[PDB]
Design a protein around this ligand. Sequence first.
Ligand code: DGL
Ligand code: DGL
Ligand code: K
Ligand code: K
Lengths: 266, 265
Amino acid sequence: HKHSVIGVLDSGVGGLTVASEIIRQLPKESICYIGDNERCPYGPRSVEEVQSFVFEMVEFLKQFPLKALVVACNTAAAATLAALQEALSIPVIGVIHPGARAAIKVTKKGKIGVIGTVGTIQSNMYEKALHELDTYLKVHSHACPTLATVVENRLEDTAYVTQQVKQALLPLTKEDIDTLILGCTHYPLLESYIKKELGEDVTIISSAEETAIELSTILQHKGILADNLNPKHRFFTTGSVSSFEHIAERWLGYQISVDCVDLPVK
Amino acid sequence: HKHSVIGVLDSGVGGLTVASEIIRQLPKESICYIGDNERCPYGPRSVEEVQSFVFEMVEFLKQFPLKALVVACNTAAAATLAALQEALSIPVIGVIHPGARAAIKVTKKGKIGVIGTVGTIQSNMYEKALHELDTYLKVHSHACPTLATVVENRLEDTAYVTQQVKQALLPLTKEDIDTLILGCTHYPLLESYIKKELGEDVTIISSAEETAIELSTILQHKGILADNLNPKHRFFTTGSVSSFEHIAERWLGYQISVDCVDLPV
Ligand SMILES: N[C@H](CCC(=O)O)C(=O)O
Ligand SMILES: N[C@H](CCC(=O)O)C(=O)O
Ligand SMILES: [K+]
Ligand SMILES: [K+]
């Protein structure tokens, strides 16, 4: 396992929030990332379709020596995490359960909100994951379909972002919650807006931050942590390479290695 | 219908902070706790002695159907975690690694402080654990030998507690850290005093809170979570039963089931 990498898959660029947290909290691990930008968004797609696309990305990642797989996309995790964990022998870490687990840790009232794409919310995976750990939690799940697009295409228009965040969170402002799970790869970029809308009494949970610590926990439990003092990461996209590189530099603050890929493989 | 329990061992009553977090974050799991109050404290004891006492507690807990073992005592974990993980087939979760992992998650500057007993600090297990994950972290480790006794015997004397926390943390106020790991079972009981001494720029991590989520992560990864909607927990002590019951009631806010036990079994 000394040369093995962490495979990371996502529907596009959003997953860079997850990749950044793995790079920060597990600095000796090597990332091999694939974003299916050509078919993004997955949010409005059927479960069957999303599962087929995710398995195509897994086939691509299998060309590398994987020690573990992270499904960075909440929509993809909702639709295929169980299928992947059954199919693969390596650890498969999704972004939903780590967020639910962290919500249980920070809630004082046992009342949790979660926002995400229509696919993520309709799967009801967040409520199911939360109840598996604690049946006596009240979970309010709300789809916010306009947010990911807002993050990728209108983020500089602050007035527009504020209005869209206000509209998306109106249903939750009416509910009694003290914790909110950002159940979508893109939402960390809206954290400030969200906090302003919900208030100081609601603790925000990032899927990215919690998934990296969950991965860390599992790799160490399994005794497979890397010891590389200066790893390098590789990013792949099915869409425009220049487009991905540009957003990435904006989100990360630096340039990354990006290459094109065609799915299905071979 | 899976009847296995989570074994929890500690040097005494301090481990109730860890037990309370497991009960809160994993409400379907059943706890079987043993505190070696008759030989507490472990902090000033030799590593060989602590290892021997911990293995006696494990022999006691093995009488129950254990699905996992939590070493709630930071001093005991420092001295015996490796030995336990090698000797047992069930998952053994100590309180040190979860704290280090959480510190990496919250630090922005990569400068972490940790406090604990002399035994915990002398083992240097915190620095080793932190560096295993990230070699480029600066770790400041300081023993605070008087704090656990302060928590057990002088907590109502606020002027005294403030003075003892001030003296214990003086060396860390001189260091540049943005995160502090409470590397002892008793320190959550001093969180307010510690926050006041270090300021709002230092995020304080609880070993109990992080160990419970680490346990949760591992039980679910292994597919062994309980589904019990109303479990019951049992506590055992090698010291005075009435004394344990009294402190427990003060710390938890309610009474618990406590029985006496003799080690070695
Ligand atoms: N990455 C998706 C957001 C984008 C999409 O709809 O594909 C998610 O985390 O749910
Ligand atoms: N339980 C110990 C504190 C008490 C003792 O010294 O035994 C620890 O967490 O380090
Ligand atoms: K393509
Ligand atoms: K004194």
